[PDB]
């Protein structure tokens, strides 16, 4: 899920952080887009991905409706936009 | 601070249905980006105890003080 911040986020990182012995050197970056994971799925047992479930229907058209409805709400919860709240500088999200 | 949700007995009801905040860092000696702890100084042993005592309370009252209602964006 792609959500943005009004004020760009200021933070400092180390490109020497992967190694311990050498002295750390600081470098600034400015991130305005925050990404949160909302849907992961696998056809089979792979890593920690949840295995997708087979669509079931009492009738072929009933199965079609189940597939159609499931896709609509799943897609809707992804397409609909979310932005942070300035009232709490990013503690919670809100519709823009 | 754990402001994600109010604590008692919600994970169960969510199962039946079917941003991180940094508030205090400290380190005895320089390590990563942790701030250096200040060594307590007191003229008298009882004076020092009172000095560090009041330092613990206001710091930890900040730690244990509850979350903010967050009117606009609330829980989500």
């Amino acid at each position: 899920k792609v959500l943005e911040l009004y004020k760009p986020h200021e933070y400092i990182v180390d490109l020497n952080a992967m190694y311990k012995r050498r002295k750390p050197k600081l470098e600034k970056r400015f991130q305005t887009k925050r990404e949160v994971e909302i849907y992961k799925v696998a056809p089979k047992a792979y890593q920690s991905y949840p295995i997708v479930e087979p669509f079931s229907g009492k009738d072929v058209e009933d199965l079609k409706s189940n597939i159609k409805k499931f896709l609509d709400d799943l897609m809707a919860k992804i397409n609909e936009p979310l932005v942070e709240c300035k009232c709490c500088k990013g503690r919670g999200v809100i519709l823009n | 601070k754990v402001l994600e949700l109010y604590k008692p007995h919600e994970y169960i009801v969510d199962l039946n249905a079917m941003r991180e905040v940094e508030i205090y860092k400290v380190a005895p000696k320089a390590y990563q980006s942790y701030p250096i702890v200040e060594p307590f100084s007191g003229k008298d042993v009882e004076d020092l105890k009172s000095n560090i005592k009041k330092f613990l309370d206001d710091l930890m009252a900040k730690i244990n003080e509850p979350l903010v209602e967050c009117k606009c964006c609330k829980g989500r």
Partner: protein, 38 residues
């Protein structure tokens, strides 16, 4: 309706981490694969 083994473990850890009393109990190992409270 039988709950999953891993899901069963997760809720206990989440609640134990939630409302234990540091006066009387402490958590030593707090990991996804194991949990010990002393």
């Amino acid at each position: 309706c039988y709950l999953s083994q891993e899901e069963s473990y997760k809720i206990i850890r989440n609640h134990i981490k939630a409302n234990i009393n540091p006066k009387f109990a402490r958590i030593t190992s707090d990991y996804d694969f194991c949990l010990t409270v002393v």
